[PDB]
């Protein structure tokens, strides 16, 4: 029997615009965002802590409980202070 892993999308926003180069921590996994501002994680069932950090000093946190074969998109806005020139 194969336990189908959950798929978690995490989007980092700064009042609408995607944050480039933000680091998203979900469980033990780390992803540094591209132009999307979106990281996709494939995770085994369980409860996880999502944390989005960006070099400006802004952070967003959300705790998520994932079942078997769950698909969840998470959208976290870090405010206007997370918007940096170029």
């Amino acid at each position: 029997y194969d336990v189908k892993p959950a798929k978690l999308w995490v989007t980092a926003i700064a009042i609408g615009t995607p944050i480039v180069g933000a680091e998203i921590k979900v469980g033990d996994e780390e992803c540094t965002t591209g132009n999307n501002g979106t990281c996709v994680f494939e995770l085994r069932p369980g409860t996880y802590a999502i944390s989005v950090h960006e070099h400006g000093g802004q952070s967003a946190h959300k705790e998520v409980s994932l079942e078997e074969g769950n698909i969840l998109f998470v959208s976290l806005d870090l405010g206007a202070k997370a918007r940096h020139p170029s």
């Binding site: 999308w9 132009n35 999307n36 501002g37 996709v40 769950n70 698909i71 969840l72 998109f73």
Partner: protein, 116 residues
């Protein structure tokens, strides 16, 4: 996914008719299904933006291509032109409702040009 299709095939028939015609439904080893774009939890449904389509695993190429656009392009028609639209802000909403519906699409929704 089976459940999305079965239920919506009657509830919103046209969406399922379209989906079944799409390459997404026929994709292997796993199809890009309703759940792939919208989520599994019906209480935690999401609407997929250009960012969702433009993930590295999927259509990053087209997202990045579009994103190469400058001011007055499909890359900025929402974020600049519409989000900072003087008249839209100035007026009651509805006066310029059409502007939201028109301007956001190219940048935010990839159902543009090739319909969902």
């Amino acid at each position: 996914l089976e459940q999305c299709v079965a239920c919506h095939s009657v509830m919103t028939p046209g969406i399922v008719r379209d989906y079944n015609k799409s390459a997404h439904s026929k994709a292997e080893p796993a199809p890009t299904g309703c759940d792939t774009c919208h989520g599994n939890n019906h209480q935690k449904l999401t609407m997929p933006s250009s960012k969702a389509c433009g993930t590295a695993e999927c259509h990053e190429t087209q997202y990045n291509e579009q994103g190469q656009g400058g001011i007055g392009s499909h890359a900025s028609c929402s974020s600049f032109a519409q989000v900072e639209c003087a008249w839209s802000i100035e007026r009651p909403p509805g006066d310029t409702a059409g502007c939201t519906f028109c301007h956001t699409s190219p940048e935010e929704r990839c159902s543009t040009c090739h319909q969902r």
